[model samples]
Target: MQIVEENLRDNEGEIKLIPETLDDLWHLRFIIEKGDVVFATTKVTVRLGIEVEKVEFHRFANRLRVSGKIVAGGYHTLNITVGKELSIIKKWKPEQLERLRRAVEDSNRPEIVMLTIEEGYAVAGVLRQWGVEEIFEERMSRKEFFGEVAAKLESFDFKYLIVAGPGFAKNDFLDFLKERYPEMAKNAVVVDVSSVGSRGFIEILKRRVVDKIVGEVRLAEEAEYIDRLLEGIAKGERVAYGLDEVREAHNYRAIEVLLVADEFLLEEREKWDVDGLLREVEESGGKVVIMSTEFEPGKRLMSLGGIAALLRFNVKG
Candidate 1:
């Protein structure tokens, strides 16, 4: 999902496109809002049952003209209003359907607890956690902070801790934790950030503390592996492109994770046998994740050419 162009008007917006493949739709999902204009490469086809008034197709440019109310937003599914009827256009594969089903059934997805602390003293941090309503903002003392954090860890099956704050609070809190909970030191992370709110979350990600925490907490430190895999793909080195190349990887049971763009799924849903591709991956015991183009870095992959996979084991060409 890559952003080709974004034009924001005072009341409405429009995004121009050079969509090369279907995965490109991932990028489009973010830009499109309810009651906005969408001009696309191919003739837009909504199901006949879908009722919306403004949807039209431009045959000359082979473009889809969509001007309606958007209902849902995400990487996989899009719900828009055509005239008065609500329509849902989705990209689906058999494996994705199964995963979605499993996700719905399984209750345990990792929970993230955002914590904050203040000053270097014990009273300050403790007072904050106990008194403050917002966990993201309230500062706490090292003693109270760790005590509360430990209590929460004990209560919930939480495996990761994202400790963030401004000034000397994070540093001081880390010192207290290192001295107090030396045994639980491995589980704790100290992030140096300015604000304790949303900005702090972004900072933690930038420093890769969240990725590390996810690895240790979820016991699935696959982010780095996936990042490296994408890097290789960008360089045209270890990664495989196209169904032919990926199919060979599947034959060897080499693919660890199959990352497909949402837009790619949409385009291929019409022409190719995507079900077969997914079946091959599943048969080979690989996992799949559909990434959205709304994420800037994920969108960059489109420029490197869409569709790539990470391998579990090394392959020699």
Candidate 2:
């Protein structure tokens, strides 16, 4: 996402035009005062000087206003002038569009859901607002448990499910799923954990069960690609990482998608940052996805350790 134009607001909160560019918008944190307005164009080219709606930038990064008739053209082009002094003309290729689209589409507000299972009964607790009905607890025999779980699995509209409990119950549940609702097996996860009910659910999440679920859910949207990436990594195939690899991919312009962690901003706070790496990937015109660490599959990342990346180009070298 790039900012095209901005205007500073006077004490009376009126719009004042300012030059706009990637560099200009980059320094917005430092330059644009609170209550200022901004205008932006995206994903299409327009005539050099087309007036768009006026935008307000208030409270630093809090609010923005958009007003004016800005036209978008093909080729991911944007043109904007700020302060009547600076003007920028930018263009993005098809790859950039895919990257931006993925980022925008995959971005979800953070949410957590807790699932508890014990004595062949399962119940779900509300850890966050998802506007879904709760799955109440009910006891049943092993055979009945499979039937119930299968029925519930088929009934719920959720894309992900976490199966967790003490002893071998989780494993047993997984077995039942594998035997009964094999189709739903892909969406089901087994978590070996103690406790049940609300506490068990929270425990499972804290231990990264929920995080893994989220990750798998996200990946499920692109399961084929993810599976291929993992298979390649396992087979000692070369996978891209860091800037150099991104540059090589960019030269070929072969990066089909970019995968990133949502913790990217936080990761930058420490040494060995991946933010720089992500920027490079984006610059190379690769699609980027910011995976949520709070999700179950994201937590499973620890199994692979941090810094796992994939590429579109075959890394034979």
Candidate 3:
């Protein structure tokens, strides 16, 4: 995402920006809020001040819809797509701006695409900060399959490609990529997996091959944190679970890393000051990682009261 313009004073302002990818569109889910006036093109283009009543992120559709009652008249839903400019006017929160800043920084990082291919089928997805967004599937093809996959990948501007599968088909596809999409082939890495499809995507992450190529990915880090939390529980080390236990640890400034499910903040914020607690953690030199419940490790974390913390020292009850 690119920030076309930013003007703010006393938390009230307008930010004009362009969404560069589906990932950028996803970030808007948090940055935009109900009642914020948004301006974007729909058809031939008349900028309406939409009082955003709802924000829907259609991951599969590769678009974001910000809809609300327009001050001028009827309802309007801004169809925010990649490479389109939009302006948002609102009183921004520090965390929301932080998220926008992160999105901008993410644009500078290497974009990665993953493909899980087997003898007759393949699944492709683009990696986002939240999780992998499956682009398309290729099934029941032989040598011609490689060409089809290459064609499907033509529109994406990615820096790395990860090809994984059980048999030698992945290698064969890599050879085809070299012959056809030579630039992509140079950045491609192959790994072995037991199967193809969505399962293969998780397997690739479990192997941490992406880390070997790219530096750090949120999903792998989330998995590792959960693993550490489990180990801490088994060993009776510096770990806390549930909101009560985490809150107790937080009072002592013992948290080194605080892991909270995204749903906790989105769904349960009315019950607790989730943002306040996160700010407190940051103020105390602790790190905050909001895990995506869309994935396995995050789902596991959510089962633990949607909040957990790794501590610098064990807090006494």
Candidate 4:
């Protein structure tokens, strides 16, 4: 995502979002709050209307503004994709802006489209945000479908293409691309993935089929962090889990890096002042990593009470 405009004065901030990837959606989810002005083109059957209301962030990252309005009567629930600019104005804590900056800074440049095809079904998606969005199911001949994909491909100035999925359909698609789209064929990489679509996209990452092609991404880094955390758990080194344990570690200034799941801040607010604790973590000079619930490692982290800390020094249980 691109920051089109930014102004921070008296903690009442307005920033323009030129979202470039699905990862930006994750960033917007944490940054944008209720009662914010998010104006976009919402069509109602025949004409257009402006909607102003307090919008909630339901984790729909594509050009999301929580809520606000204009001429429109009702705010529309529209799925915004990852390639548009929208204006947002709201008053939030400076640390929230800092978190948003990290989320945005945490996104990867998806230069490779991991194309997975099987029989009549086909999927073409960029790496990192490993999921199907635009292209999922398809019909028509192989060459014909690939042509449509190429047309869609025009939007992003992508460099590489990794064709996945089962059977000869993969190579068959490659042959067609090689004969017709020679430029893409030169850049294409082949890797074996267990499933297709979003599942396949994720498998591609888990199996490290495209890491050689795509290289180091935020998710990859997170995966490594998780590995470290797991090893720390196994050997009983320097890791803390659960709210009480993590808080104790935090009290001792043992947290080197704090990894909290997104839901903890969203869902656990009533039970505890998670926001206050997050602020304390920031003030105490601990690095915060808001683990997205979209991926496996994040889901694993969430399974452990949505809060964990990588400690600077060992603390007694």
Model 2 C-alpha lDDT per residue in residues 107-137, reported as the tens digit of each score:
3423433455666677764444433235656
Least accurate 10 contiguous residues by lDDT in model 3: 211-220
- List model 3 lDDT by residue over 1-317, tens digit each: 77888899998899999865444665676678888899886755677778899987553445678899987528878888766888999998898788788777755546789998887788899988667889898877236977888888777678789998888989989999898888889889898776677888888888867655633354666799999999999998999999899999998999999988766766655566566787788778887777667778779999988999999998975
lDDT at residue 213 of model 4 (Cα atoms): 52
Residue-level error in angstroms, candidate 2, position 140: 3.4
Model 1: runs farther than 4 Å from truth?
A: 1-225, 230-238, 251-253, 312-317
lDDT of 4 at 180: 74
Q: In candidate 4, what residue range of length 10 has the lowest lDDT sum? A: 55-64
TM-score between model 1 and native:
0.37
lDDT of each: 0.46, 0.47, 0.80, 0.66
Clashes, model 4: 8
Residue-level lDDT for 228 in candidate 1? 71
| lDDT (Cα, tens digit) per residue for candidate 1, span 1-317 | 11234444542343333332222222223223334433322225542221123543232222334554333231122232211122223333344334434433322324444455555312111112122223322224124755565444445444455567777766665666677666444566666666655455555557755434433432232345447766886775656756667767777878877766545555665777664576567566775555444444336544444456787765656
lDDT of 4 at 132: 36
Indicate whether candidate 1 or candidate 4 has the larger TM-score.
Answer: 4
- Tell me the TM-score of model 2: 0.40
Least accurate 10 contiguous residues by lDDT in model 2: 14-23
Cα error, candidate 1, residue 105 (Å) = 11
RMSD of each: 12.8, 14.4, 11.3, 10.9
Candidate 4 global lDDT: 0.66
